[PDB]
Amino acid sequence: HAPRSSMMSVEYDGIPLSQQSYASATDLVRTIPSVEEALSTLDRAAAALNARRYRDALKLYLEGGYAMANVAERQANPKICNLLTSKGFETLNWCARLCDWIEGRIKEKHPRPGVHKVGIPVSNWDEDWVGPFMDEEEARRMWYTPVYCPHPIDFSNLGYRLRCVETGRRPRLMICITMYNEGPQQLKATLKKLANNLAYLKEQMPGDEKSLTGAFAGDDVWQNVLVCIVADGREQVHPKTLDYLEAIGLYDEDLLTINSAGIGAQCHLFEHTLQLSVNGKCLLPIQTVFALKENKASKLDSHHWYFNAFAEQIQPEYTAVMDVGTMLTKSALYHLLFAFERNHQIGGACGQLTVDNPFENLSNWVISAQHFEYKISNILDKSLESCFGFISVLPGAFSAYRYEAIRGAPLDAYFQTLNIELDVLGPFIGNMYLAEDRILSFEVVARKNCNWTMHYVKDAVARTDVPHDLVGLISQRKRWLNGAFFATLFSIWNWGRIYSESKHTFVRKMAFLVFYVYHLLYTAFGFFLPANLYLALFFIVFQGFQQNRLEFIDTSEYSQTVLDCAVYIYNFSYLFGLLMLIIIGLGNNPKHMKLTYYFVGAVFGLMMMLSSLVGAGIFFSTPATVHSIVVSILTVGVYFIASALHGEVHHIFMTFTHYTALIPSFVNIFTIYSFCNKGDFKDVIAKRRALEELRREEKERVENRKKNFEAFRTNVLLTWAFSNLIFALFVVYFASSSTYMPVLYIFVASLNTCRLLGSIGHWVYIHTEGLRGRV
Amino acid sequence: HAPRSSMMSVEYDGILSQQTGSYASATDLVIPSVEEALSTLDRAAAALNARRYRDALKLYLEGGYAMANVAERQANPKICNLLTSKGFETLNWCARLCDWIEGRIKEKHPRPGVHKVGIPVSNWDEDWVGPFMDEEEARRMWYTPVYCPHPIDFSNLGYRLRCVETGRRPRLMICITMYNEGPQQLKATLKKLANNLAYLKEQMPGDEKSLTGAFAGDDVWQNVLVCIVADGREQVHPKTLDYLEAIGLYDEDLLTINSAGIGAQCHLFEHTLQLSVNGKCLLPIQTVFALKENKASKLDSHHWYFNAFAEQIQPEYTAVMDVGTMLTKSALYHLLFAFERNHQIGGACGQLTVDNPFENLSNWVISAQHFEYKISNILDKSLESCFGFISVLPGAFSAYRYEAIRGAPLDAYFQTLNIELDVLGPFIGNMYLAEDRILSFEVVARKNCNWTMHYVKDAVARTDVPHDLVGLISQRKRWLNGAFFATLFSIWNWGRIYSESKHTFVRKMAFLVFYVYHLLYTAFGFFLPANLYLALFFIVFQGFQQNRLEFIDTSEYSQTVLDCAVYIYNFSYLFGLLMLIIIGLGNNPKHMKLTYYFVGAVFGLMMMLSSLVGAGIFFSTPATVHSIVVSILTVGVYFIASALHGEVHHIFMTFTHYTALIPSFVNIFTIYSFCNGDFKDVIAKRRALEELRREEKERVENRKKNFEAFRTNVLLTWAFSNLIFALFVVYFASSSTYMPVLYIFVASLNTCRLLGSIGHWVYIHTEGLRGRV
Ligand SMILES: O=c1ccn([C@@H]2O[C@H](COP(=O)(O)OP(=O)(O)O)[C@@H](O)[C@H]2O)c(=O)[nH]1
Ligand SMILES: O=c1ccn([C@@H]2O[C@H](COP(=O)(O)OP(=O)(O)O)[C@@H](O)[C@H]2O)c(=O)[nH]1
Ligand SMILES: [Mn+2]
Ligand SMILES: [Mn+2]
């Protein structure tokens, strides 16, 4: 009791010691503004305008205007004084306009601050430079404007204009560069490659049958080409990248902050016909418009902005979409434009995607495997598809379209994920639209009342920098095969539109039906690819080792323990690896398990290298019958035949070992990880309750969306995995190698015959259409 | 070319503030209101939080004068008075802050003065019966917002409670954590607490069995404080808030007004609320309600409760329970009786049961949960309380005396909150995902203190278990996820009991014996899925295939069905397990109710047929002495303990339902648990801002990477250990060589649990007579 009394006594001493003048406080607060509070006040005004509170929006607008008007006087930097004075004057003009609008002397719908584009001198210039002809206004001045347009369809309706439109020049070919958290060297390489393309376009000889004629002639082509660089978020772009953009005279943080205070811009446009010099050669000027967007979005949203806003503004003749860090050959644009002009029927084209410096760093197995995969995918698949006038464009590939089969329905279908929220669409459409450039491909192919096909250009080589690590490749294939496994399902489900709506020729529709049957067979085979690979390895290797079917070894008697031990070890290792793959995939992100993924990949690697050696052994021990040699050459050397036919066989000769070492890891891991993922207080209280109910409804909608997405993905993954497992178990238990290996050989031979025929058709078409152009 | 020329001509025609080196009319166009006053105040609070003292005062005067002008126009007398009082207080705080800035008054970390406001309660009952009450306390309700970021300084910042102000010194102190529940659970909990207080009141005096001291009759309600702490005002149920207003404890108007510029961290509402049910008027109950704005954890609610309020009023015993936990009339009496008579228990745990077991007997999930609760309580709690160390069940109604929980145990409990979990790691994260048993271990192994624990059987606490298998999945997802790392902690740091704590030699020897048993039990339960699969496979299917079921002769048969049974069982089990891990480690187990129910039913009828063949195998065997001994000791241990403790009818009713849910239980729950200035200064400030944002994002992603990697590594270890063990025993051991081993292991575990239950019974029925010695 004594400690309790002592503690309460010290507490009682504790409570004693507003406890635990207005004129003086009034004098203190009365006793200058600043840029920080001015910017905060304009930000609050923009928020109020967004929330449609006009009285307090106005009240916060004149305060900020006068704050910057007073601040501009005391600043020391003349450019800062000019920027703040202009901002204050424009804000006062907008305040007067808003006051008049509220008074009603002028009637207008949805008032917004007037669109003001400002041109500030570029900090850095090269006095020693060579150019055909350029005006001081365009050359020296850098133009920037902030845009609020939420629906890029109304970008031109809100008075936004580009420097090309203002000077009256008419761009025809127009390229997009979607950049996000990329280093300066990638942008520098991309811009240097584009400048090289423009220079090579200039160097076309006039009066030649092969050379292009028209708006793409020499000495005047750079004017007709506009490059649009659209970033994904100002909070995610690399600081070194922004430093590079300032160095090339295209970005200014000070100007952006000053002139984007009260506008509440969704994205910022910087326009500059930037010129570049590399060593002693000076690149020709390239027209560049840089669209830096405020909030983080997706590549689909970047394309939404690009396509809708700028394309509907300037009506380009050809529209090109390209990633960041992709180096183009000198003649990539020439080949694209040549194909477009000579065909006058192509709705869209895809360039060849390759790996930068394949020969260099040959010690890296992942790089060589990716190079082999790119080369085989391009040659075989793209040739076969372009023979049929329909391309499943590789993600990230340098692709272009003509803005005549893209203007309407294909773009609406492409952007319907953004326009209509995916909750109504469902999870199938969302997974469809993770990668939808191929959706654009299909929509252009199936345009109503239009027969616009596609074409794959082998000569338009686009060199990119593929990931050098297995985890980066895993993430890449997480995106790629998903888009893929869903746009494919779209293609089967909607192949009827090509005949129901589009007006193709009868022969074209028959060819499309044939390609549809082939595509069904190929997708069905690739769906059971893990099961088929496991069965092939199991049967051939281990049931030749156990049943003495390897014609180079004699395992008739042996110890009888190792014979079954090999099969048991293989089955257990494969099953354990697959289960670990499920757990890790579906589980955590594939970056902290670099060691585990490398271990599993190496296990599969030596597993298919020993498989390759035993396959070569049985092949060489076989007496090489006519049928056997025919099927073997057709199924294996199809890659070498196509590569030698097209010219690039050395890449395959160098990378086939690296790819076949990475084949099981490739299929298993990548597919499994892809499939694995002035009111009063009563009004105040009512507003609080309404906001709370809005938050609750938003949370319930988000959780319902997540529930639907995860349920759909788990259902599709369970279907895929259980189908593979059931197929493998059933064939293992009810079919021998003699009854299943011939079937698998016939299936793979049919697919490889189709791909060889496609590549041969592409070659003969591209080498014979020139002479037979008259007929 | 014509369309392009036409389009450009159209743009030229459409192109009419218009589209280096008037204002008077707008000014003339340019009264206050409550909304802008609240917004202004609010920011002022944000600026003060950002240490913008030079700005703060001006917005504070703006808000103060805004409300000073607003209060006159309000027609509501109570709103007018409240706004006028808040404006006067805000102006006083503004003057004090101005003096502090001028420097005439020097103070550290200025903050608005803490003031408690007493408004009359909307609802009062004229007709009531009570011993004695003052009009001030009964008629009026007090409230105060708190800023204390570290609840350790609750008393330092000047916060006082009505008990402290009136001089009442609470001794028993009981917490009720609440989050997004409905009014009926709170009403049931408060009615049960009032019943407990009534039982404590009507205890006869001058009796050996009856309590004596501060818990006597007619005055017990004064000495007990109820602290109900919510988790977030954005998550509490609207109906719950209406109930709190009805009982005179909550006010949206008062909270919004008085919390405008304080930037409080939680809101305290104090009201000795009186409740009346039918013709019986319940005795008043001292209740303090702490509502915090931002969603937090039950650990954070306990942080607030323990640190702030316990360090303020220094209770003799502190107690913790959830909402929806109906306590019997004698639960509090039994807790206090045990505490007073022992003077050695550092913390106690009450029995957890299911509300209305007999009713709704058709619900297999309810019956299985009732069986699990009963057997867990009896066996595990009795065995653990015999050794004076309880792994308290999560959500159970537990209490600790505030003498072995004051310091180091509480610091160890809250260290996850005090120091960020990035330094601790994922082990400590899933360690403190549930740590009531962490309190248990710290109390047991507190340095220079030997405070054991005691499980009270008679203090029955009835809760409302989920009625759906998905709800049971989520419950077990929390429960044994915490429990596994709890056993890991106890296993790793069992050396502290001998190195630091000063227990008796016999107590340390008993603790060592229990440690050996706990090691064996945790090892057995780690391989529980593998052991269950082996038992089912061997017994059922290798008796069917090898003709070892003594009630049937399958010697010849068709030779196809014999292998077909084993193949079907293996394939179904493997497919079920793979689907389980995927569904478990993928999507949230609430959209897949059909799939989970299908797998659970498959396992259910599977163990029904397993039980039928076992019974056949137990009725066709000549029942030798060894066989009957092992079988009774391994199976009827539940019935023996239940008959010893008197609660055998529950087992008789729910054993079939539980054995129908054993494989789902063990497989699904274990899998789903283990499976989861100028312009330059402005620019520099922006650079600091998004650099800090990037650093925080990197830290969060690194924390997530580490936690997920540890989770996946542990899950891989568990699953692969189970699979390797199962495959090895299947391929290298027959049933005749592994069934005896499994029977001996389970018999040893059940013998330990039976001995613990019997010891608890004999102790609780013999310690009374042998109290002299
Ligand atoms: O959220 C994102 C991620 C990327 N990108 C950009 O859009 C393209 C997507 O290609 P990415 O490099 O992501 O694909 P990959 O080459 O990694 O397979 C690239 O230009 C990215 O910089 C984007 O706009 N938003
Ligand atoms: O984020 C949360 C979730 C719950 N709770 C509360 O803390 C206890 C957690 O027990 P839970 O309801 O999870 O267990 P159950 O009653 O479901 O078995 C309950 O009183 C919850 O209302 C909390 O404070 N914070
Ligand atoms: Mn890229
Ligand atoms: Mn509960």
Please state, in angstroms and rounded to a whole number, the distance separating the CA atoms of residues A157 and A159: 6
> Distances in Å between the alpha carbon of B3 and those of A452, A731, B6, B7, B494?
22, 64, 5, 6, 86
Answer whether A710 sits within 8 Å of B588, measured CB to CB: yes
Task: Identify which of A510, A502, A174, A457 has the alpha carbon closest to the alpha carbon of residue A313.
Answer: A174
DSSP string computed for B423-462: HH-HHHHHHHTS-HHHHHHHHHT-TT---EEEEEEEEEEE
Cα–Cα dist B363/A247, whole Å: 72
Query: Are residues A543 and A666 both part of a single domain?
Result: yes
The tally of domains found in chain A comes to 3
Does residue A42 lie within any of the structural domains? yes
Residues B103 and B208 in one domain: no
Least distant ligand from the CA of B290: 2
Distance, CA of A187 to CA of A231 (rounded, Å): 12
Residues A148 and A110 in one domain: no
How far is the C-alpha of A270 from the C-alpha of A234, rounded, in Å? 13
Last residue of a domain, one of B319, B343, B363: B319
Q: Does A19 reside within a domain?
A: no
Interstrand relation of A346-355 and A453-464 (parallel, antiparallel or unpaired)? parallel
What number of residues does chain A have?
775
Chain B hits for A121, CB-CB cut-off 8 Å, are 20
What's at B306, amino acid-wise? F
Residues A285, A516: Cα–Cα separation, whole Å: 46
For residue A692, the chain B residues in CB contact (below 8 A) are 234
Domain match, B65 and B149 both: no
Query: Using a CB-CB distance cutoff of 8 angstroms, which residues of chain B are in contact with residue A680?
Result: 33-34, 74
- The number of beta carbons lying within 10 Å of the beta carbon of residue A481 is 21
Ligand that lies nearest to the alpha carbon of residue A480, given by its number in the listed order: 1
Q: The tokens of B58 are what?
A: 């001006």
**Helices marked H in B202-264:** 238-246, 252-258
**Cα A395 to Cα A440: distance, rounded to the nearest angstrom:** 12
User: Left, alpha or beta for B103 (phi > 0: left; psi -120 to 50: alpha)?
Assistant: left
**Is there an atom of ligand 1 within 6 Å of A299 CB?**
yes
Query: Do residues B158 and B136 make contact, with C-beta atoms less than 8 angstroms apart?
Result: no
Are the beta carbons of B155 and A695 separated by less than 8 Å? Answer: no
Q: Degrees (nearest 5) of the Cα angle A501, A506, A508? A: 80
Contact across the interface for A593 and B712, Cβ inside 8 Å: yes
Closest Cα partner for A28 from B363, B696, B101, B650? B101
Say how far apart CA A592 and CA A471 lie, in whole Å: 9
Nearest CA of chain A to the CA of B746: how many Å?
Answer: 30
Half-sphere exposure of B710 (CA within 13 A, CB side): 15
Nearest-angstrom CA–CA distance, B770 and B773: 6
Q: Which amino acid is at A509?
A: K
- Do residues B281 and B128 lie in contact, with contact meaning Cβ atoms separated by under 8 Å? yes
User: What dihedral angle (degrees, nearest 10) is formed by the CA atoms of A259, A261, A263, A269?
Assistant: 50
Active-site annotation holder among B436, B458, B468, B553: B436
- Closest residue of A to B706, CA-based? A592
Angstrom distance (rounded) from CA B148 to CA B111: 11
**Mutate: best of A4, A145, A588, A700, partner B, most B CBs <10 A:** A588
Same structural domain, A755 and A655: yes
Q: Which two tokens stand for residue A209?
A: 């049958």
Output the CA torsion B412→B415→B417→B423 (10° steps).
Answer: -140
Cβ proximity of B749 and B520 under 8 Å: yes
Rounded CA gap, A173 and A401, in Å? Answer: 10
Per DSSP, helices labelled H in A647-736 are 650-665, 671-675, 681-734
- Ligand 4 center to B463 CA (angstroms): 7
C-alpha to C-alpha distances, A571 to A198, A531, B661, nearest whole angstrom: 57, 13, 33
The residues, ordered by sequence, that sit 6+ positions from B276 with a Cβ below 8 Å of its Cβ are B125, B128, B282
In a domain, A478, yes or no: no
Distance CA B773, CA B767 (A): 9
Q: Is B198 among the domain residues?
A: yes
In this structure, the answer to whether residues B238 and B100 fall within a common structural domain is no
Q: What angle, rounded to 10 degrees, do the helices at B469-492 and B436-444 form?
A: 20
| Cα–Cα distance, A311 to A172 (Å, whole number) | 10
Helices (H) and strands (E) in chain A, counts: 32, 13
Would you put residue A207 in left (φ > 0), alpha (ψ -120 to 50) or beta? left
Domain that holds residue A320: 141-204+216-325
Residue A239 is inside which H or E element, if any? Answer: helix A239-247
Alpha carbons A270 and A287: distance in angstroms, whole number: 11
Beta bridge partners of B267: B145, B291
The answer to whether B397 and B331 are in contact (CB under 8 A) is: yes
Q: Distance between CA A360 and CA B80 in Å, rounded?
A: 81
Boundary of a domain, candidates A278, A308, A325: A325
> Is A692:B565 a contact under the CB 8 Å cutoff?
no
- CA separation for the pair B190, B221 (Å, rounded): 13
Distance CA B270, CA B142 (A): 5
Residue B93 lies in a domain: yes
In a domain, B425, yes or no: no
Q: Residue A295: CA atoms inside 13 Å, Cβ hemisphere, count?
A: 7
In contact, A444 and A452? CB cutoff 8 Å: yes
Please check whether residues B242 and B296 belong to one and the same domain.
yes
- Sign of the Cα pseudo-torsion (A562, A567, A572, A573, in order): positive
Q: What interhelical angle do A506-527 and A737-768 show, nearest 10? A: 140
Give the residue, out of A176, A180, A303, with the most ligand 1 atoms within 8 A of its beta carbon, to mutate for a pocket test.
Answer: A180
Beta bridge partner(s), residue A345? none
B669: nearest Cα among B563, B568, B740, B584: B584
d(CA A278, CA B770): 99
Classify residue A116 as exposed, middle or buried by CB count within 10 Å of its CB (0-12, 13-18, 19+): middle
Straight-line distance from the first to the last Cα atom of chain A, in angstroms, rounded to the nearest whole number:
114
CA distance A498 to A450: 10
Structure tokens given for B631: 């079988």
B161 & B75 share domain: no
Instruction: Give resolution in angstroms.
Output: 2.9
Cα–Cα dist B199/A605, whole Å: 74
Whether residues B286 and B158 fall in one domain = yes
Structural contact between residues A246 and A49, judged by C-beta atoms closer than 8 angstroms: no
Best of B13, B17, B680 to disrupt the A interface by mutation (most A CBs within 10 Å)?
A: B17
Which domain-ending residue is among A114, A131, A150? A114
Q: Measuring CA to CA, which residue among A602, A618, A534, A609 is closest to residue A570?
A: A534
**A559/A606 same-domain check:** yes
- φ, ψ dihedrals at A274, nearest 5°: -70, 140
Give yes or no for a contact between B285 and B191, defined as CB atoms under 8 angstroms apart.
no
Are A109 and A150 members of one domain?
A: no
Q: In whole angstroms, what is the distance from residue B210 CA to residue B205 CA?
A: 7
Regarding whether A48 and A162 lie in a shared domain, the answer is: no
DSSP B211: -
In degrees and rounded to multiples of 5, residue A227 shows phi and psi of -110, 125
The helix (H) or strand (E) run that includes residue B321 is strand B317-322
A60, part of any domain: yes
Alpha helices in A281-425 (DSSP H): 299-304, 312-314, 332-343, 365-376, 383-387, 409-419, 422-425
Residue B15 lies in a domain: no
Task: Kindly compute the dihedral angle of the four CA atoms of residues A469, A471, A476, A479, in this order, to the nearest 10 degrees.
Answer: 180
Residue B256: which of A57, A48, A683 has the closest Cα?
A: A683
Which chain B residues are within 8 Å of A583, Cβ to Cβ? 581, 585, 712, 715-716, 719
Smallest Cβ–Cβ distance between A679 and the set B17, B35, B679 belongs to: B35
Expressed in angstroms and rounded, the spacing between residue A356 Cα and the centre of ligand 3 is 12
Cβ separation B705–A97 shorter than 8 A: no
> What does each C-alpha distance from B304 to A648, B162, B421 come to in angstroms?
71, 18, 19
Exposed (0-12), middle (13-18) or buried (19+): which is A85, by Cβ within 10 Å?
middle
Q: Is B289 helix (H, G, I), strand (E, B) or coil?
A: strand
**A-interface mutation test, from B594, B595, B712, B723, most A Cβ less than 10 A away:** B712
Starting at the edge strand that comes first in sequence, how are the strands of the sheet with A118-121 ordered?
Answer: A118-121, A141-147, A267-272, A287-293, A225-231, A173-179, A318-322, A399-402, A346-355, A453-464, A327-328
- Distance CA(A35)–CA(A38), nearest Å, equals 5
**Phi-psi region for residue A730, left (φ > 0), alpha (ψ -120 to 50) or beta?**
alpha
Give the residue whose CA is nearest to atom 11 of ligand 1: A396
Burial of residue B647 (CB within 10 Å: 0-12, 13-18, 19+) is: middle
CB B625 within 8 A of CB B339: no
User: What CATH number is attached to the domain comprising B54?
Assistant: 1.20.58
Sequence-ordered strand ranges (E) for A23-155:
118-121, 141-147
CA diameter of chain B: 115
Note whether A587 contacts B585, CB cutoff 8 Å: yes
| Whether A56 is catalytic | no
Q: How many CB atoms lie within 10 A of CB B757?
A: 24
Q: Which residues, by Cβ under 5 Å, contact ligand 4, an ion?
A: B 322, 324
Name every residue whose Cβ is closer than 8 Å to that of residue B460 and which is 6 or more positions away in sequence: B327, B328, B331, B350, B351, B353
* C-beta atoms of B693 and A80 within 8 A: no
Are residues B260 and B38 in contact, defined by beta-carbon separation less than 8 angstroms? yes
Helices (H), B307-435: 311-313, 331-342, 364-375, 382-386, 408-418, 421-424, 426-432
